[PDB]
Amino acid sequence: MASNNTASIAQARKLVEQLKMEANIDRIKVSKAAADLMAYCEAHAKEDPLLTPVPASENPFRE
Amino acid sequence: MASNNTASIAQARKLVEQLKMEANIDRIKVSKAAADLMAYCEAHAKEDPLLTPVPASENPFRE
Amino acid sequence: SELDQLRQEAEQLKNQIRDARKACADATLSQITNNIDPVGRIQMRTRRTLRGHLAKIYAMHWGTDSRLLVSASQDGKLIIWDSYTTNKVHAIPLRSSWVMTCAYAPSGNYVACGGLDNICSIYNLKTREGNVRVSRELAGHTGYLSCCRFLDDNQIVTSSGDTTCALWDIETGQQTTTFTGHTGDVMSLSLAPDTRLFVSGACDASAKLWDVREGMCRQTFTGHESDINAICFFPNGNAFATGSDDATCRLFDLRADQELMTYSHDNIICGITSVSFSKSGRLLLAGYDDFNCNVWDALKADRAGVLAGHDNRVSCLGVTDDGMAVATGSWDSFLKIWN
Amino acid sequence: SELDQLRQEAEQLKNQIRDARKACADATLSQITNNIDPVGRIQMRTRRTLRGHLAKIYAMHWGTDSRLLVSASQDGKLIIWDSYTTNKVHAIPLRSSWVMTCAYAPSGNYVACGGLDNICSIYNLKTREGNVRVSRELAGHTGYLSCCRFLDDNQIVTSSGDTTCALWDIETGQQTTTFTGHTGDVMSLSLAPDTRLFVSGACDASAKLWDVREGMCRQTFTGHESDINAICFFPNGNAFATGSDDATCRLFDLRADQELMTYSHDNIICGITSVSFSKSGRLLLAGYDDFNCNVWDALKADRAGVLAGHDNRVSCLGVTDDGMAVATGSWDSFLKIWN
Amino acid sequence: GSVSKWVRLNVGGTYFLTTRQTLCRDPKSFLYRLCQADPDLDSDKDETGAYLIDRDPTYFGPVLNYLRHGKLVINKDLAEEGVLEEAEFYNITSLIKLVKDKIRERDSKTSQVPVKHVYRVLQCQEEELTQMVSTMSDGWKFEQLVSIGSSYNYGNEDQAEFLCVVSKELHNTPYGTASEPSEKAKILQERGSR
Amino acid sequence: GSVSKWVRLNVGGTYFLTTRQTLCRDPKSFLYRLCQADPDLDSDKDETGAYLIDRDPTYFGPVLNYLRHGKLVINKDLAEEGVLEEAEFYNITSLIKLVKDKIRERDSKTSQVPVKHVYRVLQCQEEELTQMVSTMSDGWKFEQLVSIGSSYNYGNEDQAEFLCVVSKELHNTPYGTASEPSEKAKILQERGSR
Amino acid sequence: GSVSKWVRLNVGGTYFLTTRQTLCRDPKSFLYRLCQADPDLDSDKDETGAYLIDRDPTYFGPVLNYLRHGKLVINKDLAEEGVLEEAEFYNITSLIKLVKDKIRERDSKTSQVPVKHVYRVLQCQEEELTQMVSTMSDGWKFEQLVSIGSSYNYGNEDQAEFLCVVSKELHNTPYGTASEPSEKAKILQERGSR
Amino acid sequence: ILGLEGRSVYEEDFEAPFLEMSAEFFQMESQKFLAENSASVYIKKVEARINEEIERVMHCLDKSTEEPIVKVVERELISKHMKTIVEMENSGLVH
Incomplete structure (x- = not known):
């Protein structure tokens, strides 16, 4: 064993491995992704009962 | 028999038979059947105590 | 293929049946003859509430003796009641739960x-x-x-x-x-x-x-x-x-x-969810998936009365063979002897 | 051996990853914008007190069907609570005590x-x-x-x-x-x-x-x-x-x-100890080892409000799939429904 | 030479002379297929004209018992599971049924070690109590009686006065710890759940 | 088959070498044919020549012992139900009664396996409670006591003081001979039902 | 005649008939050397056929069942320890593990006396207890319902009105993968202690 | 098999000696072939010897030696004859 080393290195390989396709993934900038999320939330803000007034007939916890 | 859609033709034969007896069975017009039902129901109205007040001891449920 | 031909044949047979019914179909004399004595609204009060159950009642069935009702709860419990005194003639555990149907024999x-x-x-x-x-x-x-x-x-x-x-x-x-x-x-x-x-x-x-x-x-x-x-x-x-x-x-x-x-x-x-006839068959009592049920006229097709007083749906109905009352296999765990 | 080269390569790739992320790093428009849908102070009510646990509740998970919530108590008991009615479908005894997690299947x-x-x-x-x-x-x-x-x-x-x-x-x-x-x-x-x-x-x-x-x-x-x-x-x-x-x-x-x-x-x-999003995901529901929990405005980086209650830590949170309400699986042996 | 009205079959080491009729419990059974000669079979005991197949005769025991007698009774010391394995190898759905019924009976008999045990709750009034415990159904064992407060009619003699709790060792499932479900049952269970 | 004073039966492939005279106890049983060396029952084996009986040796044991020495001994490791079935096969009514008595003893001893099990409730207050708990019958086992609300004072020294649910492991009799009603008994049952 | 395509073994002096391939399902077994035609045999006889296998035929049964269809059989008369001995004689590792699990399941109930019985307590009211007991979990036995005294919300019709304690016997193998907890498990344990 | 998974044991005992004596044999054989053979004959003969060495490695010897042997032969017949087969007495690539 002068080229295998009883496979004690594999863990480090995995580390290296993931880092490679941590780099391969593109970078979407902070502000733009943030804005996308704000648009999604605010569009979904009306359909979120926590963000809207709730009549007793609206919530299944008072009917 | 599957290749004949699991012998669905047997349903056709049964429906042939159903038409046969339905034609054999006399057809009583709606008006006179309703007349017969009125006669039976009205003839049995007085002995249907649901239609009449029941004293506090007539029924076996206030006894 | 000719399987579709036999299906067509079935279709035309059903068409003939519809034609024969339509020829048999006439004006319903009972509804037009609505000058029959009014059914009004029967104010209906239960004389005996059967709190012996504590689970929902799914089926119920009076006996030929017309005094014992066999109301079954889906928990695996039969309660052969005494409808005339509100007493449990029998309380039978069932080998399996979720029993939906119970019937009482001509044996009695x-x-x-x-x-x-x-x-x-x-x-x-x-x-x-x-x-x-x-x-x-x-x-x-x-x-x-x-x-x-x-x-x-x-x-x-x-x-x-x-x-x-x-x-x-x-x-x-x-x-x-x-x-x-x-x-x-x-x-x-x-x-x-x-x-x-x-x-x-x-x-x-x-x-x-x-x-x-x-x-x-x-x-x-x-x-x-x-x-x-x-x-x-x-x-x-x-x-x-x-x-x-x-x-x-x-x-x-x-x-x-x-x-x-x-x-x-x-x-x-x-x-x-349930249909029944009165002693005369003039009153048709309908159980509904809402708590309160109804009874309509089988003659004038109008509500003879309302079975009100329930708190959950009624899953079965049974009228007295003497017409004294009707038991309601409700889901509020009480059978209500509506006299 | 050769492991040193592999580890140094991992280090330099980590450095590269940090550099690439910092290149991606820009001003967070959410933090910059202080007017994009402010949420204000929100005060919320306990509408259902699912009393019936006497031991702490470790994990509670709703199902995608979002009517029944599975809640596990580390004593070894599951309750499939019916939140709408304040009852349960099953109280399943668990052979093992100290059950950490219970997850309700998508099929319910x-x-x-x-x-x-x-x-x-x-x-x-x-x-x-x-x-x-x-x-x-x-x-x-x-x-x-x-x-x-x-x-x-x-x-x-x-x-x-x-x-x-x-x-x-x-x-x-x-x-x-x-x-x-x-x-x-x-x-x-x-x-x-x-x-x-x-x-x-x-x-x-x-x-x-x-x-x-x-x-x-x-x-x-x-x-x-x-x-x-x-x-x-x-x-x-x-x-x-x-x-x-x-x-x-x-x-x-x-x-x-x-x-x-x-x-x-x-x-x-x-x-x-517990993190969750609203239906919009604009609210961040954070349960804490503190007896009370909180909500942040998820896209404004500030606390939307404080959800104060219990007297003990809340070990898990679960939001109604629709954003209707939240169940608080806590260590005070109660599951509170907040809506 | 090797086949007659009767046939000699070597299940395990031993050789049983049994009629070809008795060995088959359904024409899908492997044993019946082995009754008549097939071109596929190569290894056999031609020393006495008896076909060689490789299974334990101990679990052939209850199998041949059911086949000869028409009723399956698996010994309390022998694995009903071994009988089921014998049946599944020999592909006899009838034997699958009986082993299933016997396994349900055993699970009732072994309803002390973990396997489902039926428990039920009944209401009774103070007066009715003696009757319904006395008229409590055979095959059920009384497990507990609890007094409760009376919400009607003073503190005693109440239509809801005592909760009896009984049980049955036989499980309520159609078979063992798992039964093949039905969808409409789940539909109605959801209907009644809410 | 081969002629000998004894006879060798191939009971389930197993050679039972038993004397012909002990098999003449019940001509009304299948065995008395198998003992005929003359052409009344002819049966052979292409390996030994033994007569062939398609009855199990599983429950043939106790029945053969009953034939040999007049008394059945059901081994307490084999189903008494199987012994009853073997008795039915040879339809020996005395043997049927004996195996049914064994099954009744089983069911009384195994009343917690779902079979007959009788239950009652006594009513007593503490003074008599000690007495009849002490003078409880041999066979009847105390299972539960309970108090009932006392309108006198708050507790003891009221006639309605303690219900005493007691039980007994009762024998289940195999059906067809037991639990057979009567007409006047049903008349009185209907009279007392109300 | 020992082997042509089939093998006649003499297991502990008991002759059994099988084929080379049924034993060749697992080609690591001890019977591999015995069955195959080779002069490596240290015990065989060709004067009347059949290799000499000086081993248990009583505990060869379940092992051969696993060798034929990969399934262990746990009889009620079977010493699970003894079949473990035979399996380790015939080197079936998965069978070894399964029989070890069977041995420990039997010991945790029988030989180690009934131990580590799991007990649980469940809060229920009447409307909940009725179907909870009705929907009682598989492999679990009802043990006791008790009515807690209540002043808030009367002493009846309260979600906290009854406590039902149930149990499940563990005829269960202690975990050999590690029944001893790890450090973080104990950390969470002390966290949940108070 | 005596390393119980070990190529280390064979590496210690006999993985190397084959390589070393083969290297010396190819040294002497290549020099002799250069002495006796022209361009094409020498090229095809050394190629045939290389293929026969791989033949021995697969059918006469284990597989564990395949990676070492290619490295040995690459520096023994090719890198040893870098521009001695490119040109010789009126033979070679240029000629």
Whole structure:
């Protein structure tokens, strides 16, 4: 064993491995992704009962 | 028999038979059947105590 | 291929049947003759509330003696009541829970129950020992025992799962004859006072009136729009009231061999879960998936009264064979003896 | 040996990753914008007090059907609470005590249990038997199960101990895809609405976002310095809030491949034991080892409001799938419904 | 030479002379297929004209018992599971049924070690109590009686006064710890759940 | 078969070498044919020549012992139901009664296996409670006591003081001979039901 | 005649008939050397056929069943320890593990006396207890319902009105993968202690 | 097999000696062939010897030596004859 080393290195390989396709993934900038999320939330803000007034007939916890 | 859609033709034969007896069975017009039902129901109205007040001891449920 | 030709043939046969019914169809004299004495609104009060149950009541069935009701709760409990005194003649645990159907025999001492067990349990109320020892445990069923009704002391009908409404010899525990032909599950059965013709209401919305004395169907009433919950014959057996998961009751006449007259309802839209006739058969009492049920006129097609006072839906109805009252197998765990 | 070269290569690639993330790093428009949908102070009511636990509640999970909530008490008891009615469908006794997690299946008919034992329990809640029976015991887990989530109804992600969060085939009981690479037990397990990526939080303080089809870990989000208590995906599955044993929650972004933004206060120092998003995902529901919990404005980086209650820590949170309300599985032996 | 009205079959080491009729319990059974000669079979005991097949005769025991007698009774010391394995190898759905019924009976008999045990709750009034415990159904064992407060009619003699709790060793499932479900049952269970 | 004073039966492939005279006890049993060396029953084996009986040796044991020495001994490791079935096969009514008595003893001893089990409730207050608890019958087992609300004072020394649910493991008799009602008994049952 | 395509073994002096391939399902077994035609045999006889296997035929049964269809058989008369001995004689590792589990399941109930019985307590009211007991979990036995005295919300009709304690016997193997907890398990244990 | 997984044991005992003596044999054989053979004959003969060495490695010897042997032969017949087969007495690539 002068080229295998009883496979004690594999863990480090995995580390290296993931880092490679941590780099391969593109970078979407902070502000733009943030804005996308704000648009999604605010569009979904009306359909979120926590963000809207709730009549007793609206919530299944008072009917 | 599957290749004949699991012998669905047997349903056709049964429906042939159903038409046969339905034609054999006399057809009583709606008006006179309703007349017969009125006669039976009205003839049995007085002995249907649901239609009449029941004293506090007539029924076996206030006894 | 010619399979489609035979299907066409079936279609044209049904068309002829529709034509014959339409020719048989006339103006409903009862509804136009609404000058009959008004039914008004019957203020209905229960004289005896049956709090002996504490689970929902799924089926219930008065006996031939017309004093003992066999109300079954889906927890696996039969309560053979004393309707006249609110006493439990018997409280029977069931081998399996989720029992949906219970029937009381012409014996007056045999009781039937069907759950998801796929085994029809007939309990002998009276034995030499004095306890409710089971009479028979009829196995052989494929699907769940959707409904059961006693034909005789040793003959019964079990509208089971898997499109089965076969007749069963109780003594042998085997099918007497096989009743089949539905493409949907059979969960509704009705007992004519003839006690020789049972109209099975399956999930395919097809009230097939079968003759018990033959192994083949007698009539096939249709017009339904959903699976048929319950069917009640008239006190003459000349016609039967049908209720499905629709907003209207129906009345199918055998002599007319067609839907005699429908009970349209838009004041209530909940599915008709149970149907019944009064002692005269003039009052048709409809159980509804809402707590309060109703009773309409079978003559003027208008509400004779409202069964109000419930707190949960009623899953079965049973009228006194003397017409003194009606028991409501509600889900509020009380059977209410509405006098 | 050659391991030094591999480790140095890992170090330089980590440096490259830091550089690429910092290049991606820009001003967070959410923090910059202080007028984009302010949420204001919100005060919320306990509408259902699911009293009926007498021991602490470790994990509580709603189902996608969002009517019944499975809640596990470490004494070894599951309650399938009916939130709408203040009752339960099942109180299942658990053979193992100290049950960490219970996850309600997407079909709402299976439930999963992971306790201190090395067996994952799969109970088929609904069957023709009418009662709960164990669908599948899953044996062969190396470490102790900490969190689990149903990826299907025949397979499930099970973050056991020993850095194992391997996918498990329910039918065969054998793990199919093995997920290893953390340090210590994989303790947290977040299921995405994407359902294609589960981000596991362990004692490595590294939110490893794994693909649920390949054992290769999609991304390795980092920034947390403590073991990760809870991870909740955004209602998009494109980002997730990560709460660890600190006062700092971290909203990590998959598109940015870096921590989108951070939540921290000097008012709070307890570990963020439970993290969750609203229907919009605009509200971050953070349960704490503090007796009370909080809500942040998720996209304004500030506290939306404080949800004060109980008298003991709240060990888990579950938002109604619709954003209707939240159930607070706490250690004061009550589950409070806040709406 | 090797086949007659009767046939000699070597299950395990021993050789049983049994009629070809008795060996078959359904024409899908492997044993029947072995009754008549097939071109596929190569290894056999041609020393006495008896076909060689490789299974334990101990679990052939209850199998041949049912086949000869028409009723299956598996010994309390022998694995009904071994009988089921024998049946499944020999592909006899009838034997599958009986082993199933016997296993249900055993699970009732072994309803002390973990396997489902039916439990039920009944209401009774003070007066009715003696009757319904006395008239309590055979095959059921009384387990507990609890007094409760009376919400009607003073503090005693109430229609809801005592809760009896009984049980049955036989499980309520159609078979063992798992039965093949039905969808409409789940539909109605959801209907009644809410 | 081969002629000998004894006879060798192939009971389930197992050679029972038993004398012909002990098999002449019940001509009304299948064995008395198998003992005929003349052509009344002819049976052979292509390996030994033994007569062939398609009855199990599982429950043939106790029945053969009953034939040999007049008394059945059902081994308490084999189903008494199987012995009853073997008795039915040879339809020996005395043997049927004996195995049914054994099954009744089983059911009384195994009343917690779902078979007959009798239950009652006594009513007593403490003074008599000690007495009849002490003078409890041999066979009847105390299972539960309970108090009932006392309108006198708050507790003890009221007639309605304690219900005493007691039980007994009772024998289940195989059906067809027991639990057979009578007409006047049913008349009186209907009279007393109300 | 020992082997042509089939093998006649003499297991502990008991002759059994099988084929080379049924034993060749697992080609690591001890019977591999015995069955195959090779002069490696240290015990065989060709004067009347059949290799000499001086081993248990009583505990060869379940092992051969696993060798034929990969399934262990646990009889009630079977010493699971003895079949473990035979399996380790015939080197079936998965069978070894399964039989070890069977041995420990039997010991945790029988030989180690009934131990580690799991007990649980469940809060229920009447409307909940009725179906909870009705929907009682598989492999679990009802043990006691008790009515807690209550002043808030009367003493009846309260979600906290009854406590039902149930149990499940563990005829369960102690975990050999590690029944001793790890450090973080104990950390969480002390966290949950108070 | 005596390393119980070990190529280390064979590496110690006999993995190397084959390589070393083969290297020396190819040294002497290549020099002799250069002495006796022209361009094409020498090229095809050394190629045939290389293929026969691989033949021995697969059918006469283990597989564990394949990676070492290619490295040895690459520096023994090719890198040893870098521009001695490019040109010779009126033979070679240029000629």
